[PDB]
Scaffold this active site. Structure first.
Site, PDB file in Angstrom:
ATOM      1  N   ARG A   1       4.548  -1.032  -4.859  1.00 32.50           N
ATOM      2  CA  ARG A   1       5.980  -1.115  -4.595  1.00 32.50           C
ATOM      3  C   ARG A   1       6.909  -0.271  -5.461  1.00 32.50           C
ATOM      4  O   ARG A   1       8.124  -0.274  -5.241  1.00 32.50           O
ATOM      5  CB  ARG A   1       6.439  -2.582  -4.622  1.00 32.50           C
TER       6      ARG A   1
ATOM      7  N   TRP B   1      -0.632   5.571   0.830  1.00 28.45           N
ATOM      8  CA  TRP B   1      -1.884   6.207   0.463  1.00 28.45           C
ATOM      9  C   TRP B   1      -2.768   5.170  -0.220  1.00 28.45           C
ATOM     10  O   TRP B   1      -2.286   4.153  -0.706  1.00 28.45           O
ATOM     11  CB  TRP B   1      -1.645   7.424  -0.432  1.00 28.45           C
TER      12      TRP B   1
HETATM   13  C1  HEM Z   1       2.556   4.405  -1.609  1.00 30.74           C
HETATM   14  C2  HEM Z   1       1.307   3.880  -1.733  1.00 30.74           C
HETATM   15  C3  HEM Z   1       0.865   2.573  -1.454  1.00 30.74           C
HETATM   16  C4  HEM Z   1      -0.170   2.027  -2.109  1.00 30.74           C
HETATM   17  C5  HEM Z   1      -0.999   2.722  -3.194  1.00 30.74           C
HETATM   18  C6  HEM Z   1      -0.334   0.686  -1.648  1.00 30.74           C
HETATM   19  C7  HEM Z   1      -1.393  -0.153  -2.042  1.00 30.74           C
HETATM   20  C8  HEM Z   1      -1.572  -1.472  -1.579  1.00 30.74           C
HETATM   21  C9  HEM Z   1      -2.736  -2.273  -1.897  1.00 30.74           C
HETATM   22  C10 HEM Z   1      -3.893  -1.840  -2.797  1.00 30.74           C
HETATM   23  C11 HEM Z   1      -2.644  -3.400  -1.121  1.00 30.74           C
HETATM   24  C12 HEM Z   1      -3.753  -4.449  -0.849  1.00 30.74           C
HETATM   25  C13 HEM Z   1      -4.633  -3.866   0.257  1.00 30.74           C
HETATM   26  C14 HEM Z   1      -5.788  -4.767   0.664  1.00 30.74           C
HETATM   27  O1  HEM Z   1      -6.373  -5.437  -0.225  1.00 30.74           O
HETATM   28  O2  HEM Z   1      -6.121  -4.782   1.878  1.00 30.74           O
HETATM   29  C15 HEM Z   1      -1.380  -3.279  -0.381  1.00 30.74           C
HETATM   30  C16 HEM Z   1      -0.923  -4.234   0.483  1.00 30.74           C
HETATM   31  C17 HEM Z   1       0.247  -4.139   1.228  1.00 30.74           C
HETATM   32  N1  HEM Z   1       1.099  -3.043   1.236  1.00 30.74           N
HETATM   33 FE1  HEM Z   1       1.027  -1.443   0.050  1.00 30.74          FE
HETATM   34  N2  HEM Z   1       0.651   0.343  -0.731  1.00 30.74           N
HETATM   35  C18 HEM Z   1       1.344   1.546  -0.539  1.00 30.74           C
HETATM   36  C19 HEM Z   1       2.322   1.710   0.452  1.00 30.74           C
HETATM   37  C20 HEM Z   1       2.805   0.678   1.284  1.00 30.74           C
HETATM   38  C21 HEM Z   1       3.877   0.845   2.236  1.00 30.74           C
HETATM   39  C22 HEM Z   1       4.662   2.113   2.504  1.00 30.74           C
HETATM   40  C23 HEM Z   1       4.185  -0.364   2.759  1.00 30.74           C
HETATM   41  C24 HEM Z   1       5.096  -0.623   3.798  1.00 30.74           C
HETATM   42  C25 HEM Z   1       6.209   0.103   4.111  1.00 30.74           C
HETATM   43  C26 HEM Z   1       3.289  -1.285   2.126  1.00 30.74           C
HETATM   44  C27 HEM Z   1       3.141  -2.597   2.545  1.00 30.74           C
HETATM   45  C28 HEM Z   1       2.067  -3.409   2.160  1.00 30.74           C
HETATM   46  C29 HEM Z   1       1.864  -4.760   2.637  1.00 30.74           C
HETATM   47  C30 HEM Z   1       2.708  -5.490   3.710  1.00 30.74           C
HETATM   48  C31 HEM Z   1       0.741  -5.219   2.047  1.00 30.74           C
HETATM   49  C32 HEM Z   1      -0.077  -6.478   2.384  1.00 30.74           C
HETATM   50  C33 HEM Z   1      -0.798  -6.252   3.706  1.00 30.74           C
HETATM   51  C34 HEM Z   1      -1.808  -7.333   4.044  1.00 30.74           C
HETATM   52  O3  HEM Z   1      -1.549  -8.528   3.759  1.00 30.74           O
HETATM   53  O4  HEM Z   1      -2.858  -6.978   4.619  1.00 30.74           O
HETATM   54  N3  HEM Z   1       2.439  -0.642   1.213  1.00 30.74           N
HETATM   55  N4  HEM Z   1      -0.729  -2.107  -0.655  1.00 30.74           N
HETATM   56  N1  LIG Z   2      -2.922   1.336   0.828  1.00 24.59           N
HETATM   57  C1  LIG Z   2      -2.454   0.464   1.792  1.00 24.59           C
HETATM   58  N2  LIG Z   2      -3.023  -0.643   1.874  1.00 24.59           N
HETATM   59  C2  LIG Z   2      -2.784  -1.820   2.783  1.00 24.59           C
HETATM   60  C3  LIG Z   2      -4.125  -2.271   3.350  1.00 24.59           C
HETATM   61  C4  LIG Z   2      -4.003  -3.483   4.269  1.00 24.59           C
HETATM   62  C5  LIG Z   2      -5.316  -3.799   4.923  1.00 24.59           C
HETATM   63  N3  LIG Z   2      -5.364  -5.298   5.089  1.00 24.59           N
HETATM   64  C6  LIG Z   2      -6.486  -5.954   5.454  1.00 24.59           C
HETATM   65  O1  LIG Z   2      -7.553  -5.367   5.681  1.00 24.59           O
HETATM   66  C7  LIG Z   2      -6.385  -7.469   5.575  1.00 24.59           C
HETATM   67  N4  LIG Z   2      -7.553  -8.077   4.879  1.00 24.59           N
HETATM   68  C8  LIG Z   2      -6.361  -7.915   7.053  1.00 24.59           C
HETATM   69  C9  LIG Z   2      -6.339  -9.419   7.235  1.00 24.59           C
HETATM   70  C10 LIG Z   2      -5.178 -10.165   6.882  1.00 24.59           C
HETATM   71  C11 LIG Z   2      -5.158 -11.568   7.047  1.00 24.59           C
HETATM   72  C12 LIG Z   2      -6.296 -12.235   7.565  1.00 24.59           C
HETATM   73  C13 LIG Z   2      -7.454 -11.495   7.914  1.00 24.59           C
HETATM   74  C14 LIG Z   2      -7.476 -10.087   7.748  1.00 24.59           C
HETATM   75  C15 LIG Z   2      -5.540  -3.026   6.251  1.00 24.59           C
HETATM   76  N5  LIG Z   2      -5.076  -3.529   7.381  1.00 24.59           N
HETATM   77  O2  LIG Z   2      -6.139  -1.967   6.295  1.00 24.59           O
HETATM   78  N6  LIG Z   2      -1.388   0.790   2.646  1.00 24.59           N
HETATM   79  N7  LIG Z   2      -0.552   1.829   2.641  1.00 24.59           N
HETATM   80  O3  LIG Z   2      -0.672   2.843   1.841  1.00 24.59           O
HETATM   81  O4  LIG Z   2       0.404   1.793   3.486  1.00 24.59           O
END
Ligand code: HEM
Ligand SMILES: N=C(NCCC[C@@H](NC(=O)[C@H](N)Cc1ccccc1)C(N)=O)NN(O)O
Ligand code: HEM
Ligand SMILES: N=C(NCCC[C@@H](NC(=O)[C@H](N)Cc1ccccc1)C(N)=O)NN(O)O
Ligand SMILES: C[C@H](O)[C@H](O)[C@H]1CNc2nc(N)[nH]c(=O)c2N1
Ligand SMILES: C[C@H](O)[C@H](O)[C@H]1CNc2nc(N)[nH]c(=O)c2N1
Ligand SMILES: C[As](C)(=O)[O-]
Ligand SMILES: C[As](C)(=O)[O-]
Ligand SMILES: [Zn+2]
Lengths: 404, 406
Positions: A111, A280
């Site tokens: 964030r 990313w």
């Molecule tokens: C700029 C680089 C970014 C990095 C390095 C990053 C990294 C991460 C990481 C490591 C997680 C957990 C992923 C997982 O365990 O599946 C995460 C979750 C999340 N990120 Fe970021 N993020 C980035 C950009 C964004 C952007 C641009 C948004 C939205 C505009 C965002 C929204 C979210 C949300 C909503 C979650 C939780 C999603 C879920 O519950 O599956 N992220 N992010």
């Molecule tokens: N680096 C990230 N990471 C966000 C990854 C979120 C990742 N989340 C997951 O794989 C969640 N475990 C999906 C899930 C949620 C709740 C119940 C079951 C399963 C996905 N969608 O690929 N995003 N950027 O850069 O935007």
């Protein structure tokens, strides 16, 4: 009333006053904590209040609260909601709401970047065909030839009675998972189901471990349509190790663009059932979870054996050893292919700056400790030692049911 | 479905419902508005002591399968009587043993609870002087250490009496290294114990000046200044640290004590409060090799070790920390094993905890667990507990944190 938050590594202490802004209840109660759970178990009034609140947030952000425009805008809202039971957002509010949603997301460790977000307005979308058009431009822009740029594309909001616009896939780019002979699974087991739904609506499957899935786009009250992404559009990174020359043989690879496409974006009451966003990857997402999870690619023993480790016993820490090299591999590769990527050490340190910035700017920051602390080397990173408060703020990204 | 929290394991896909949390009677720090589950520390009425005493007695009689029996009814009448005339009451020998084991069983932050039924409970409720406390403590250490083949155990001192000063052990553990504040401001030894070291000195101790000086015990009897006692070096078992293939590691002169003995928790049973009831089991390797030797606010040896391994510590992307953290843990495991001292790696321990959850699901309908504490400090998702959802709530008997006696 206001939680005391302490960092056990430095002794510093802050008070989270931002939580009082929460208008929605989480899963816990004073009797028991359900914070480790992944998933939680309108009348003109509702929409109106949320809309007014959101509009107040928008004008405070542009330092014109209580102004003339603020007044007329709140009136346009009363007016539209009064006769149609709902309203629409101006492009600049939408941009404010999207950035704000990222900012309020407790499970995101990146964030610190919340302020730099390219918002693509696709609310004038009428078919799955147009959706595929907008999606191809998002990927093209976000990827930017490896020098990734954060972005989000917002499709039409939900409308009472009508079907939602949806992106069946959970990421714009995901590898197929094929159930074979026995319980065996070729590819990515997490995508077994969506892969089968793709074969069901056509699609000639492949038989590889890393086959990029097709997209299943759905327009309101219509069956989803299958589209295939132009391979030159989907950037990938072959994995190799800086010193372990045979690692490359494994034929491992991952896609450069993490584009979440399954979440719902809520802004001032409106809900955008389809709004894929992308930044990313943080190396542990690929290196540890995607490749080492037992229910994912599960390549831990393979690389262990190849490394000549003793997998016979746990005490040799063969699991830990292989995990570190595999993660090193992901980092080495990406940097070599010149594709944006951040290691868990650099990410958590920036997240720490983010907490400080937010402490001064709003008096706190919603954070899910279990998700912020990385999958490996938890205590070797600074967030492990940082206490956190979790609560729900709006705008927000929320999970929603799967279309099927 | 059911009106209890649903609990899923995302690796296997299995579900369970926790009905045990309905037994809780002490609220925690969360509210539907915000979750404070990641906080380390969340911020007698004759009538209330009865409610707790009566509850504990029912618990005891159900464990022996005699709920409703005459003996059960008589014990209740007796407890009420004793409190109705003295404002407190005493636990029979067997109930202390049951209660002690149940407190461990109910500890949300302990990953070794599969061993809960096997605990040696030493009753020392007769104790009446700091000197006596020291004999008991030495005996406990002797028995628990058992020359490397560690045995879980707990020693219980007199409960808190009306107006009368508590029995207290000032140290956080019976065996801990001193922390010496340098003039330049650095710390020699274990930084976490700087305060307990200074207090010992003020109380008369003659401090050494090494990185690993076993501290003296500050034992406080009811209404008295704590007297100081030194532990015979033969009692305190230690393990020098070497690495299996990195020969220079031994040159670092690192070492650690074998007996983990928490001495600052309060054992609470049926409303009775045992301010001094030290317990010990045995180490999970990460405690030593990751938190104690690598935390930046503890020994912090990560860089020293990375430099010896010839890693590039100028860039986080080299994962030099991860590489050194691993080898250091491998050194702890290797050294305890070579020294024939009981130790358990985080993979073996988490696996056993998963077994404990399955046992408790059948026996009580659930198990109170603190995810942030159960999941290991290194290699989280590589262990099974990382994928296991967990419900956290306070159950009594219990081990509670208590303010320092100063
Ligand atoms: C700029 C680089 C970014 C990095 C390095 C990053 C990294 C991460 C990481 C490591 C997680 C957990 C992923 C997982 O365990 O599946 C995460 C979750 C999340 N990120 Fe970021 N993020 C980035 C950009 C964004 C952007 C641009 C948004 C939205 C505009 C965002 C929204 C979210 C949300 C909503 C979650 C939780 C999603 C879920 O519950 O599956 N992220 N992010
Ligand atoms: N680096 C990230 N990471 C966000 C990854 C979120 C990742 N989340 C997951 O794989 C969640 N475990 C999906 C899930 C949620 C709740 C119940 C079951 C399963 C996905 N969608 O690929 N995003 N950027 O850069 O935007
Ligand atoms: C038999 C081997 C045992 C192992 C491997 C074990 C392991 C652990 C570990 C890894 C922790 C967390 C340590 C930390 O992060 O500081 C812990 C905490 C705890 N254990 Fe166990 N344990 C064992 C025996 C015991 C015994 C015998 C009792 C008590 C009867 C017990 C009571 C507790 C309590 C109350 C905590 C919480 C301490 C705190 O909050 O600081 N454990 N245990
Ligand atoms: N293996 C163990 N492990 C328990 C270790 C407990 C460990 N606890 C700690 O070091 C906590 N950080 C103390 C604390 C809690 C809250 C606020 C400030 C400070 C200790 N005492 O040495 N024990 N057995 O076997 O009984
Ligand atoms: C059960 C537990 O909540 C679950 O395994 C969580 C833990 N922490 C996580 N943290 C991140 N970043 N991503 C995840 O998918 C998870 N899974
Ligand atoms: C702030 C955070 O709660 C704190 O660092 C916790 C996290 N998990 C832990 N887990 C264990 N086993 N022991 C600890 O001391 C901690 N510290
Ligand atoms: C090196 As390969 C097996
Ligand atoms: C090898 As050492 C410095
Ligand atoms: Zn909670």
């Amino acid at each position: 009333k206001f939680p005391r938050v302490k960092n056990w590594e430095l002794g510093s202490i802050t008070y989270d006053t931002l939580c009082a802004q929460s208008q929605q209840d989480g899963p816990c109660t004073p009797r028991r904590c359900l914070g480790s759970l992944v998933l939680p178990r309108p009348p003109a009034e509702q929409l109106l209040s949320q809309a007014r609140d959101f509009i107040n947030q928008y004008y405070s952000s542009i330092k014109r609260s209580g102004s003339q425009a603020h007044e007329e805008r709140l009136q346009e809202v009363e007016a539209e909601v009064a006769s149609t039971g709902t309203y629409h957002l101006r492009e600049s509010e939408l941009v404010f709401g999207a950035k704000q949603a990222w900012r309020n997301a407790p499970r995101c460790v990146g964030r610190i970047q919340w302020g730099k977000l390219q918002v693509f307005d696709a609310r004038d979308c009428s078919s799955a065909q147009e959706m595929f058009t907008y999606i191809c431009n998002h990927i093209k822009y976000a990827t930017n030839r490896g020098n990734l740029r954060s972005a989000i594309t917002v499709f039409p909001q939900r409308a009472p009675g009508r079907g939602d616009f949806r992106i069946w896939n959970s990421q714009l780019v995901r590898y197929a998972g094929y159930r074979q002979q026995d319980g065996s699974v070729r590819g990515d087991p997490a995508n077994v189901e969506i892969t089968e739904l793709c074969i069901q609506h056509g699609w000639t499957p492949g038989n590889g471990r890393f086959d990029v899935l097709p997209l299943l786009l759905q327009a309101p009250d219509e069956a989803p349509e299958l589209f295939v992404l132009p391979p030159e559009l989907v950037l990938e990174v072959p994995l190799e190790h800086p010193t372990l020359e045979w690692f490359a043989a494994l034929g491992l690879r991952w896609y450069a663009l993490p584009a979440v496409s399954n979440m719902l974006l809520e802004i001032g009451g409106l809900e955008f059932s389809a709004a894929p966003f992308s930044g990313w990857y943080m190396s542990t997402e690929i290196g540890t979870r995607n490749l080492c999870d037992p229910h994912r690619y599960n390549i831990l023993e393979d690389v262990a054996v190849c490394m000549d480790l003793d997998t016979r016993t746990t005490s040799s820490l063969w699991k830990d050893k292989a995990a570190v090299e595999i993660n090193l591999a992901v980092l080495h590769s990406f940097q070599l292919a010149k594709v944006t990527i951040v290691d868990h050490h650099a990410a958590t340190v920036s997240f720490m700056k983010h907490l400080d910035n937010e402490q001064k700017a709003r008096g706190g920051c919603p954070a899910d400790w279990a998700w912020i602390v990385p999958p490996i080397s938890g205590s070797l990173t600074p967030v492990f030692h940082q206490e956190m408060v979790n609560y729900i703020l709006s705008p927000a990204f929320r999970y929603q049911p799967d279309p099927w």
